[PDB]
Design a protein around this motif. Structure first.
Motif, short mmCIF file in Angstrom:
data_model
loop_
_atom_site.label_atom_id
_atom_site.label_comp_id
_atom_site.label_asym_id
_atom_site.label_seq_id
_atom_site.Cartn_x
_atom_site.Cartn_y
_atom_site.Cartn_z
N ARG A 2 40.22 40.09 32.17
CA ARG A 2 40.11 41.51 31.88
C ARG A 2 41.02 42.31 32.80
NH1 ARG A 2 35.87 38.88 35.26
NH2 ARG A 2 36.88 39.46 37.23
N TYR A 3 40.82 43.63 32.83
CA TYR A 3 41.65 44.48 33.68
C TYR A 3 40.79 45.32 34.60
CZ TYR A 3 44.27 43.48 29.40
OH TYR A 3 44.84 42.86 28.31
N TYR A 4 41.34 45.69 35.75
CA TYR A 4 40.63 46.52 36.71
C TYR A 4 41.09 47.97 36.57
CZ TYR A 4 39.47 42.00 38.80
OH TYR A 4 39.03 40.71 39.02
N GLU A 5 40.30 48.89 37.10
CA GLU A 5 40.63 50.31 37.02
C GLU A 5 41.94 50.60 37.74
OE1 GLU A 5 38.25 52.60 35.66
OE2 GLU A 5 38.65 54.55 36.59
N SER A 6 42.26 49.79 38.73
CA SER A 6 43.48 49.96 39.52
C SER A 6 44.71 50.11 38.62
CB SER A 6 43.67 48.77 40.46
OG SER A 6 44.28 47.68 39.80
N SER A 7 44.96 49.12 37.78
CA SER A 7 46.11 49.15 36.88
C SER A 7 45.77 48.61 35.50
CB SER A 7 47.26 48.35 37.48
OG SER A 7 48.36 49.19 37.81
N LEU A 8 46.71 48.76 34.57
CA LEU A 8 46.52 48.28 33.20
C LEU A 8 46.93 46.81 33.07
CD1 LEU A 8 48.18 51.35 31.44
CD2 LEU A 8 46.04 51.21 32.72
N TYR A 11 43.98 40.62 34.48
CA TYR A 11 43.37 40.07 35.68
C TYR A 11 42.48 38.87 35.36
CZ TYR A 11 44.86 43.50 39.16
OH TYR A 11 45.59 44.24 40.05
N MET B 27 32.88 49.58 32.69
CA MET B 27 33.39 49.85 34.03
C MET B 27 32.37 49.48 35.10
SD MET B 27 35.06 53.13 32.52
CE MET B 27 35.95 54.30 33.55
N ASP B 30 34.42 45.92 40.89
CA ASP B 30 34.46 44.54 41.32
C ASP B 30 34.72 44.60 42.80
OD1 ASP B 30 37.43 44.37 41.92
OD2 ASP B 30 37.50 44.82 39.77
N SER B 35 39.98 49.26 46.45
CA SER B 35 41.28 48.90 45.87
C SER B 35 41.13 48.64 44.37
CB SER B 35 41.88 47.69 46.58
OG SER B 35 43.24 47.92 46.92
N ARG B 36 40.67 47.44 44.01
CA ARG B 36 40.46 47.11 42.61
C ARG B 36 39.28 47.94 42.11
NH1 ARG B 36 40.85 40.45 42.73
NH2 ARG B 36 43.11 40.42 43.12
N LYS B 38 36.17 49.31 39.94
CA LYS B 38 35.70 49.36 38.57
C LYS B 38 36.54 48.54 37.62
CE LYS B 38 34.92 53.66 37.46
NZ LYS B 38 33.81 53.64 36.47
N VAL B 39 36.00 47.40 37.23
CA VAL B 39 36.67 46.55 36.27
C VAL B 39 36.63 47.23 34.93
CG1 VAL B 39 36.72 44.30 35.14
CG2 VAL B 39 35.98 44.48 37.51
N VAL B 40 37.75 47.20 34.21
CA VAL B 40 37.84 47.84 32.91
C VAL B 40 37.80 46.84 31.77
CG1 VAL B 40 39.13 49.53 31.55
CG2 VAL B 40 39.31 49.55 34.04
N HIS B 68 42.05 52.70 28.38
CA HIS B 68 41.96 52.58 29.84
C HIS B 68 41.94 53.96 30.48
CE1 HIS B 68 42.81 50.65 33.83
NE2 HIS B 68 42.10 49.70 33.25
N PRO B 69 41.11 54.16 31.53
CA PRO B 69 41.02 55.45 32.22
C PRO B 69 42.29 55.79 32.99
CG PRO B 69 39.78 53.78 33.41
CD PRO B 69 40.22 53.14 32.12
#
Lengths: 13, 74
Positions: A2-8, A11, B27, B30, B35-36, B38-40, B68-69
């Protein structure tokens, strides 16, 4: 995976 | 309708078949809320459940409403 809020970017779980 | 999904390499959006009309975006920080964090997640759905902030999902009744936010607009 999946993906983290950090970037698109993908992951691995 | 059409919702955004993240169950692949790149994130895309499809058309939910006779079953789901709403979209969802999960969300939850994690072990990196700094840094990382809230997993999306992404996916389509028919209902809109609720849970503790530790694991929440935003459900909508529109199209491409669950992106994605941090997705770069434009």
């Amino acid at each position: 995976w999946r993906y983290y809020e950090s970037s698109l970017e993908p992951y691995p779980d | 309708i059409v919702c955004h999904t993240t169950a692949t390499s790149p994130i895309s959006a499809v058309t939910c078949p006779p079953g789901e009309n709403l979209c969802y975006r999960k969300m939850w920080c994690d072990a990196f809320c700094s840094s990382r964090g809230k997993v999306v997640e992404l996916g389509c759905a028919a209902t809109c459940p609720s849970k503790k902030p530790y694991e929440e999902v935003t459900c909508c009744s529109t199209d491409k409403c669950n992106p994605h936010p941090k997705q770069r607009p434009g």
